Enzyme design. Structure first.
Site, PDB file in Angstrom:
ATOM      1  N   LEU A 274      41.552  35.019  38.901  1.00  0.00           N
ATOM      2  CA  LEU A 274      40.310  35.458  38.015  1.00  0.00           C
ATOM      3  C   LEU A 274      40.002  36.933  37.851  1.00  0.00           C
ATOM      4  CD1 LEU A 274      37.482  33.348  40.042  1.00  0.00           C
ATOM      5  CD2 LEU A 274      38.515  32.914  37.497  1.00  0.00           C
TER       6      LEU A 274
ATOM      7  N   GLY B 108      43.155  43.720  40.942  1.00  0.00           N
ATOM      8  CA  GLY B 108      43.145  45.158  40.918  1.00  0.00           C
ATOM      9  C   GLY B 108      44.087  45.878  41.883  1.00  0.00           C
TER      10      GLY B 108
ATOM     11  N   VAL C 226      41.611  38.181  42.922  1.00  0.00           N
ATOM     12  CA  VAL C 226      40.470  37.191  43.188  1.00  0.00           C
ATOM     13  C   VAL C 226      41.134  35.843  42.643  1.00  0.00           C
ATOM     14  CG1 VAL C 226      38.151  36.751  42.393  1.00  0.00           C
ATOM     15  CG2 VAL C 226      38.803  39.071  42.822  1.00  0.00           C
TER      16      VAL C 226
ATOM     17  N   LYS D 135      37.936  36.484  47.084  1.00  0.00           N
ATOM     18  CA  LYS D 135      38.528  37.986  46.813  1.00  0.00           C
ATOM     19  C   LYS D 135      39.425  38.448  48.043  1.00  0.00           C
ATOM     20  CE  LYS D 135      37.074  42.945  45.640  1.00  0.00           C
ATOM     21  NZ  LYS D 135      35.813  43.523  45.172  1.00  0.00           N
TER      22      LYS D 135
ATOM     23  N   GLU E  30      30.471  34.107  44.833  1.00  0.00           N
ATOM     24  CA  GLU E  30      29.951  33.039  43.866  1.00  0.00           C
ATOM     25  C   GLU E  30      30.972  33.243  42.764  1.00  0.00           C
ATOM     26  OE1 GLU E  30      26.225  34.182  42.340  1.00  0.00           O
ATOM     27  OE2 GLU E  30      25.918  32.248  41.528  1.00  0.00           O
ATOM     28  N   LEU E  31      31.323  32.018  42.085  1.00  0.00           N
ATOM     29  CA  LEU E  31      32.183  31.874  41.094  1.00  0.00           C
ATOM     30  C   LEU E  31      31.603  32.157  39.697  1.00  0.00           C
ATOM     31  CD1 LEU E  31      34.912  31.322  39.708  1.00  0.00           C
ATOM     32  CD2 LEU E  31      34.127  29.012  39.584  1.00  0.00           C
ATOM     33  N   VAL E  32      31.901  33.110  39.022  1.00  0.00           N
ATOM     34  CA  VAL E  32      31.325  33.365  37.633  1.00  0.00           C
ATOM     35  C   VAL E  32      32.449  33.188  36.699  1.00  0.00           C
ATOM     36  CG1 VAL E  32      30.102  34.730  36.054  1.00  0.00           C
ATOM     37  CG2 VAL E  32      29.842  34.925  38.725  1.00  0.00           C
TER      38      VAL E  32
ATOM     39  N   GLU F  32      35.168  38.589  31.537  1.00  0.00           N
ATOM     40  CA  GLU F  32      34.677  39.609  31.703  1.00  0.00           C
ATOM     41  C   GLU F  32      33.929  39.916  30.305  1.00  0.00           C
ATOM     42  OE1 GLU F  32      37.620  42.715  32.095  1.00  0.00           O
ATOM     43  OE2 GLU F  32      38.530  41.862  33.939  1.00  0.00           O
TER      44      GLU F  32
ATOM     45  N   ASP G  26      30.001  51.583  40.014  1.00  0.00           N
ATOM     46  CA  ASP G  26      31.212  51.098  39.249  1.00  0.00           C
ATOM     47  C   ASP G  26      30.855  50.087  38.238  1.00  0.00           C
ATOM     48  OD1 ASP G  26      34.032  51.373  38.623  1.00  0.00           O
ATOM     49  OD2 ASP G  26      34.509  49.411  40.159  1.00  0.00           O
TER      50      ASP G  26
ATOM     51  N   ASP H 245      31.956  43.063  41.675  1.00  0.00           N
ATOM     52  CA  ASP H 245      32.606  44.138  42.307  1.00  0.00           C
ATOM     53  C   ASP H 245      31.748  45.427  42.864  1.00  0.00           C
ATOM     54  OD1 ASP H 245      34.736  45.855  43.183  1.00  0.00           O
ATOM     55  OD2 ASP H 245      35.589  46.202  41.036  1.00  0.00           O
TER      56      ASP H 245
END
Ligand SMILES: [Mg+2]
Ligand code: NA
Ligand code: NA
Length: 278
Positions: free
Chosen positions: A20, A23, A28, A43, A95-97, A101, A140, A162
């Protein structure tokens, strides 16, 4: 004040799937809790291997993110379900989103209208209002850190993600090692000054400019140019992009892209601004 997290193997309790996010210090992965079938985003934050290492994330910095996350429950912000750890990683079950992006959405879709821009922006403002009411600075905010629930509806719903740079601002400002992405950081970040909630408001101005135009207001050909541009407040509205954009939209941005944090609109100001307020 450091605490410890669940040290059973994440694998015993969850199955991972699609990736997902990725970085410098974290990855994730979608995941599913075995006991419930419910889905989350795991994460994996790489720990520091020695006190003095530059690689991985300090325990202090991990625990700050976790502590902030534990406070939050709002529709426009990610929430935290569980935390695991092992020798290598701290694993945040978030939580899953799943709609991707906002960055990618903007890239892929035609140019937004003011209504489409405001439908995104209003959700962002509501989430930031929540955070700032808790004296949480995100530090951020950018399209990469806004996730869509479902990208395939006319007015996608979003969550802010994030919290890796987020800090509690209980004394009005913080004066720590805090520096995000050059295109989105406020002048006080660039100048290494004490930082508060106001920095996020600048970032919101940048996001708004991007939502309306498809262009980044301060972006130069190098990071150092972008930073110089931010500090100087070197932006303008280009006619080619903004000729059909309302003057009130421009006013909203202009009142956020202000160098002096004291003069910048606050989150409450932004909600009451005539472009936003019913
Ligand atoms: Mg993240
Ligand atoms: Na569950
Ligand atoms: Na919620």
């Amino acid at each position: 004040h450091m605490t410890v997290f669940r040290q059973e193997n994440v694998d015993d309790y969850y199955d991972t799937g699609e990736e997902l996010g990725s970085g410098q210090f974290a990855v994730v992965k979608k995941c599913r809790e075995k006991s419930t079938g419910l889905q989350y985003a795991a994460k994996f934050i790489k720990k520091r291997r020695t006190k003095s290492s530059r690689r991985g994330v300090s325990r202090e910095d991990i625990e700050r993110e976790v502590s902030i996350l534990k406070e939050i429950q709002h529709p426009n912000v990610i929430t935290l379900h569980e935390v695991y750890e092992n020798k290598t990683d701290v694993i945040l079950i978030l939580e899953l989103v799943a709609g991707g992006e906002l960055f990618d959405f903007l890239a892929e879709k035609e140019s937004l209208t003011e209504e489409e821009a405001t439908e995104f922006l209003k959700q962002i403002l509501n989430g930031v209002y929540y955070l700032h009411s808790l004296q949480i600075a995100h530090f951020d905010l950018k399209p990469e850190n806004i996730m869509l629930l479902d990208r395939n509806v006319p007015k996608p719903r979003i969550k802010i993600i994030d919290f890796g740079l987020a800090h509690k601002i209980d004394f009005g400002n913080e004066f720590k090692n805090i520096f995000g992405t050059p295109e989105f950081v406020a002048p006080e970040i660039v100048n290494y000054e004490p930082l508060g909630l106001e920095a996020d408001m600048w970032s919101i101005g940048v996001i708004t400019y991007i939502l309306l135009s498809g262009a980044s207001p301060f972006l130069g050909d190098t990071k150092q140019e972008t930073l110089a541009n931010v500090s100087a407040v070197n932006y303008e509205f280009e006619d080619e992009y903004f000729s059909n954009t309302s003057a009130l939209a421009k006013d909203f941005i202009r009142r956020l892209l202000v160098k002096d944090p004291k003069k910048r609109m606050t989150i409450q100001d932004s909600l009451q601004h005539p472009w936003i307020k019913p």
